[PDB]
Structure 1
């Protein structure tokens, strides 16, 4: 489905309607310094690693919309509930 790159809507920061810009959330890089990272290294050993021997996998046929709404006035972003879309394209 298609979506406007920009449209007016409520900014929960400004607390008033503003033109927002919408973009797909790009994944941030892991630092590898998180507690879970330390736990993986510490608890892995001879034999099976328990949860750390698991291999993640699987996909729903259609993912939910994953989006940032950024105010063109105050520059801050907010998040919204997503909805299932096989494809999401922006109209500029």
Structure 2
């Protein structure tokens, strides 16, 4: 599926329709400073079996699209609706 690079939409910050650039959210690894990771590392130490599930080969055939729209006047990025899943996503200029 082809998607525009820019679209003019209502901006919750400007309170009016403005041009927004489309961006894809890029995944990042778990931060070692988060409380969940701290607890996981703390419990992993010592003797005993693995204390958490280890899912193997579990992943949907195609994932939803996490998009963010950045206003060209404010610079702030906002989300827009609920993502839809497609395995092809080409950004087309315009």
1:14 paired with 2:14, answer yes
In the superposition, the TM-score normalised over structure 2's length comes to 0.85
Q: Which residue pairs with 1:90 in the alignment? A: 91
Aligned-residue offset at 1:63: 0.8
Decide whether the 8 Å contact of 1:64 with 1:82 is kept in 2.
Answer: yes
CA distance in 2, matches of 1:33, 1:18: 37
Aligned to 2:64: 64
| Residue 29 (structure 1) shift | 4.7
TM-score between both structures, scaled by the size of structure 1 = 0.86
State the Cα distance separating 1:90 from its structure 2 match. Answer: 0.2
Gaps of 5+ in 1: none
Secondary structure at 2:91's aligned position in 1?
strand
Q: In the TM superposition, what is the alpha-carbon distance from 1:7 to its structure 2 partner?
A: 1.3
Alignment of 1:38-53 (within 5 A): 38-44=38-44, 45-51=46-52
Residue in structure 2 matched with residue 77 of structure 1 by the alignment: 77
Question: Would you say the 8 A contact 1:43–1:49 is kept in 2?
Answer: no
> Take 2:72 and 2:92, find their aligned partners in 1: how far apart are those partners?
17
Unaligned runs of at least 5 residues, structure 2: none
